[PDB]
Amino acid sequence: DVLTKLLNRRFLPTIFKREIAHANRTGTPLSVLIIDVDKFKEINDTWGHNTGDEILRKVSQAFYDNVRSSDYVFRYGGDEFIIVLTEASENETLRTAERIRSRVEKTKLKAANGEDIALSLSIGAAMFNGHPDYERLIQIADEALYIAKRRGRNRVELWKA
């Protein structure tokens, strides 16, 4: 059960505080992806929870196949996940997000009527900038995610000022 591997959101503060101190002291990059499964509620309502659960498993596996054991994958909300990447530059963070976006888009998953359900992700990315408050990093990634949603979904946006 790949779903049992996902980290619970209660551990966000502890992991972030550790990784923030680590990044400040080592000068390594630290970044966040906040990821929404496009149309998840509509899909769950139309096709039911078996289909929804299967989608969550396929999406979760796409995350694990594209990150390292030193990265973290959390369940953030009903439709959403947070990935914390350690030692990924801005370019590598964007490449990782794109690999994940593309993998989900290409995933074939059949509904009860034999149609393939179109799956996609919206992703907001942000780089840690040295500030001690992890909530600020989440907020800027979430602003980028909102822009990804409003610009039509199935896309990655990087926060910039």
UniProtKB/Swiss-Prot annotation:
The active site is at 79 (proton acceptor). The keyword Transcription applies. Changing residue 80 to A: Lacks biofilm formation activity, and thus is probably devoid of diguanylate cyclase activity. Induction: By RpoS in the late exponential growth phase and upon entry into stationary phase. Expression is higher at 28 than 37 degrees Celsius. In rich medium DosC and DgcM are the major RpoS-dependent GGDEF-domain containing proteins in the cell, whereas in minimal medium it is the major RpoS-dependent GGDEF-domain containing protein. Highly expressed on solid medium. A member of the dosCP operon. One of its GO terms (molecular function) is diguanylate cyclase activity. It comes from the Bacteria. Residues 28-161 form the GGDEF domain. The keyword Transferase applies. GO terms for biological process: cell adhesion involved in single-species biofilm formation; negative regulation of bacterial-type flagellum-dependent cell motility; response to oxygen levels; response to stress. One of its GO terms (cellular component) is plasma membrane. Mg(2+) binds at residues 36, 79. Changing residue 68 to A: Same biofilm formation activity as wild-type. The record marks 41 as: Transition state stabilizer. Keywords: GTP-binding, Heme, Iron, Magnesium, Metal-binding, Nucleotide-binding, Transcription, Transcription regulation, Transferase. Substrate binds at residues 44, 53. Disruption phenotype: Disruption results in a 2.5-fold reduction in surface adhesion, a 3.5-fold reduction in biofilm formation, a large reduction in curli production, a drastic decrease in csgB expression (400-fold reduction in aerobic growth) and in an approximately 3.5-fold reduction in pgaA transcript levels in comparison with wild-type. Forms a complex with DosP. Globin-coupled heme-based oxygen sensor protein displaying diguanylate cyclase (DGC) activity in response to oxygen availability. Thus, catalyzes the synthesis of cyclic diguanylate (c-di-GMP) via the condensation of 2 GTP molecules. Is involved in the modulation of intracellular c-di-GMP levels, in association with DosP which catalyzes the degradation of c-di-GMP (PDE activity). Cyclic-di-GMP is a second messenger which controls cell surface-associated traits in bacteria. Is composed of an N-terminal sensory globin-fold domain that binds heme and oxygen, and a C-terminal GGDEF diguanylate cyclase domain. This is Diguanylate cyclase DosC. It comes from Escherichia coli (strain K12). The gene is dosC.
